[PDB]
Symmetry: C2
Subunit: 160 residues, 2 copies
């Protein structure tokens, strides 16, 4: 018997914040973008609150870029009906995302509106590529109702 | 001289196409997808490009005895993101099944993998438990031993 559940997934790296094409490996000195989804269980008793992505760099030398400008350094898109309906991802309002932390080795982004059962959020995160060591990042999803943990690790090959 | 990369694409409700999933209800099949990606700057094609996937947490199991088109799929995008050629399934004889069991699978692409080209692997699993299933995906080639490793995690509803 389950009241609330959340899920996280890695979508890998891309050459643009939104759209564009996939990448990895990445050349040192170029920007690239990690994308992750947080997904609300369709069977949830209700909307979920304080749905938050935390990403931390665990290995390697690439750095999350900028001071945390929405539309440049990160994006958050809502698919209001998730995979259960034909509504597409669209960027959410700037006021709907709280930047709890933004720095070279980690970021934390909280979605302020409640997340309806089945709905999904896509987080896109700009990074500067650095070194011939793989960059690995730990991505964590939480809500108030579903603390998890829900954790993935995505890895990027960086060409020196 | 040579480099590889790996990425998770997350879970899907079909082997190819269909829609994304996760969470998954216990009792249902679902599919992990991973890409192995040949560095465009590589000196030449790479050999023995292998995906190894092993369960690190939870109770979901890789399904079936390892039948291509049912339990797994391997697609080649011959020019990767660098050109508009699409993914298409490779021939069965181009994929060596080094291992296939509930807790681990190993799939080797036998033709050489051209610089810039990408492979997409899809893997059927049976969902079990109210603990998250997490899998470790490793990419290797002869010329780029790595390893290159990601961890994808699935929420399973009891
Ligand atoms: Ca997942
Ligand atoms: Ca939708
Ligand atoms: Ca990757
Ligand atoms: Ca292509």
């Amino acid at each position: 018997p389950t009241a609330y559940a959340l899920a996280i997934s890695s979508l890998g790296e891309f050459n643009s914040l939104t759209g564009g094409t996939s990448t990895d490996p990445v050349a040192e000195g170029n920007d690239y973008y990690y994308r992750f989804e947080i997904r609300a269980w369709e069977g949830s008793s209700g909307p979920q609150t304080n749905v938050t992505l935390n990403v931390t760099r665990t290995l390697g030398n690439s750095t999350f870029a900028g001071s945390g400008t929405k539309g440049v350094d990160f994006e958050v898109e809502l698919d209001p009906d998730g995979p259960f309906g034909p509504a597409s991802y669209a960027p959410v309002l700037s006021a709907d995302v709280q930047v709890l932390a933004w720095g070279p080795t980690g970021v934390q982004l909280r979605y302020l509106p409640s997340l309806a059962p089945g709905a999904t959020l896509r987080f896109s995160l700009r990074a500067n590529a650095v070194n011939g060591t793989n960059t690995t990042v730990q991505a964590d999803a939480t809500s108030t109702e579903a603390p998890g943990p829900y954790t993935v690790f995505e890895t990027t090959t960086i060409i020196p």
